[PDB]
């Protein structure tokens, strides 16, 4: 198709330009450098995480896949922190959601669209844990506020799998975070508390809810 | 941490610069049109998809996994291909991968990792069947030929899972592709032909197979 | 090895007994005529599917996992129900939970016992949403209590899941039950009413939960 | 239900054989004994595993899914073998495979079964590697050999899994088995030799394919 042409036309653009002004860039990302944070992310991508955090340099383990879950059991999301945290020594894992998000709608809404239906339940556990706190919100703000919840409730998630509990308990400089961002301005809230042991995983999972599920059915972003 | 705090900081430094410079970058960002290519890519992440593209404008739906793998029943990917064909109607599948990668490497030396072992028994699978045109080469050019391998294992799985079938015996236009890059330049190279009908399976996948398995043992990219 | 030796004599004494006794027995299973059930129940087994229901003859299609589970994006257990339903098109879906469970036990204990953990944080996840109900229970009987709660939650990710759902609107006759029992008696208790639809989906939920979580504080099995 | 009625009074005239008859059963399952095997069969359940092996005491732990499988990175079955190996401490695993399996003649028929042709995906590729072979084979006889070749293949997987790799590491006595059986007689055949460490591996999977892959393409159990 013309647009795969396109696609290889702007890296042929880009790969020769760089080369020529930067070729550092290249050399430096050609060594085995470990990468310094695993990201966990949306398929949406809707700012990318490079922009949204000016790492240009390799320094994002990146993970993706439909609202940015740390399912219990998906040994795909699983593998990718176990490889992040034991192999590449990455001290620092996030989960990030976002507003206008497709699957978290679908959570709520529950469409009929086929195969995804099944991982979005999981987001509809969430959905139906919180539903009246949820049922109070203008029907506008509803999604984006449990995309908050949702990164809160898989940080939970990524907390209390063996990947993080082994790590932590072998005594290593693992940490969690969940970042949000509406798609106003692009910029990262921080939800709850640093949570760098098993011991303050459960009072971060309190603070980024008591910071989320606000007594003034707020949207922390916009 | 003043490492996380760094990333706050560059991303007040980006995104209110964004909004003095090019404010409908945001406001481009709010009518929400869909992306007409899913990225299929690697967890490695060295340059990003956005880079090597010049897709910007929010054109990728992006999944990321160790080794850029469509395993067959991993619900984790096969939803990211079912949303983004069915709902999203994206027209293009990419599979990225791209030399050096770790995840490749430990499948052929196989040392213990723990639990990521698992996942790229996968890959060791492909290795193991084609170990001996591999061991017919320098052991330092395997790994990115494994690489490149690889992309054409995992297309031809794609092209396989009941999502891509149902979706060409619908009618639907939707197609695959294997890219692959070395770090060197990061310049894209394609993998086979064009695969745009259930026909064009095992047409795309022996003639990748034929570039990539060549003659004189040469890697693609550098 | 020995106890190994010792199935080999087990097996070759059963066949010709039953072979000589009742041929027809074998020459009727040749005939991989449909079964009728699906039994989805725990890896423990601890009495036989074919001696709680008498059949012996391949009427059940069985799959089995640690505490009886129903995950959402569990692939295993989706596609033993899809090729059941779709191929083999069975009329009942069983979901059969037992008191005296290993991992239901501890998923409300959380002992740190490797893999498994990971499974069974999703029966953390039911364990905490009734932990009110649980807590004010004896210690004693919590494990086989939260045996109960875990057969209709099961039950209720079964109709939900895109293979119920699907054969329940393109009209197929197919229904879904819960079943429960006690190691003492082996008396199958039934946990629900009817549903062969999507429209009594609620109902059985609703009405199972509240036989569970009776005022009594009592278990349904001893 | 008719028949679901059935099921509850067979329940019924069994239970009560069992207590004012042999009430010993009962005393002995309602203690703690651990099952000394692991059987990972087929969903089909043509022969059930307690009358194939006379294992009728609790000795059995068991998984089953379609086509037996030992999948690298299914978190199901894998969560049941760790607990298994890790928790109860079996000293036997088994992988049965059989003659007239569904789901392995449809991984060779290729049709359009829903979900399942993904799962499904992984036969397929063993009938893909070892087409050449079963192609000199009886257009009948082709799906029993591949059936005898799968339980060759999900034995080597479950022996390969990190699981496995750490019992054997740690020092535990644990081994691994394939049977397959014919249904003429439900008479239980072994494909290959004791692997009871990690070094035996190779060799077990190289002997059964030897006692399998034989140069009279001639068929184990019948
Ligand atoms: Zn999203
Ligand atoms: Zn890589
Ligand atoms: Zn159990
Ligand atoms: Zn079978």
Not at 82 to 104: E, F, R
Not at 142 to 151: G, M, Q, T, Y
Request: aromatic share 10%; with cysteine.
């Amino acid at each position: 198709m013309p647009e795969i042409k396109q696609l290889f036309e702007n890296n042929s653009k880009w790969s020769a330009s760089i080369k020529a002004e930067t070729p550092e860039y290249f050399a430096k990302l050609a060594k085995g450098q470990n990468p310094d944070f695993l990201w966990i992310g949306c398929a949406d991508s809707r700012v990318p995480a490079e922009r949204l955090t000016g790492l240009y340099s390799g320094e994002l383990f990146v993970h993706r896949n439909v609202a940015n879950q740390v399912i219990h059991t998906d040994l795909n999301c699983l593998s990718v922190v176990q490889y992040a945290v034991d192999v590449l020594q990455v001290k620092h894992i996030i989960v990030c959601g976002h507003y206008g998000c497709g699957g978290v709608t679908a959570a709520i809404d529950n469409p009929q669209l086929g195969l995804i239906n099944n991982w979005l339940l999981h987001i509809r556990d969430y959905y139906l844990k919180h539903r009246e706190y949820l049922d109070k919100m203008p029907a506008e703000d509803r999604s984006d506020k449990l995309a908050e919840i949702n990164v809160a409730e898989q940080v939970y998630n990524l907390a209390n799998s063996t990947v993080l509990q082994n790590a932590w308990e072998r005594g290593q400089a693992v940490e969690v975070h969940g970042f949000v961002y509406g798609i106003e301005d692009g910029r990262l809230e921080y939800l709850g508390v640093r949570c760098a042991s098993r011991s303050a995983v459960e009072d971060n999972y309190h603070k980024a809810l008591e910071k989320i599920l606000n007594p003034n059915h707020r949207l922390l972003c916009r």
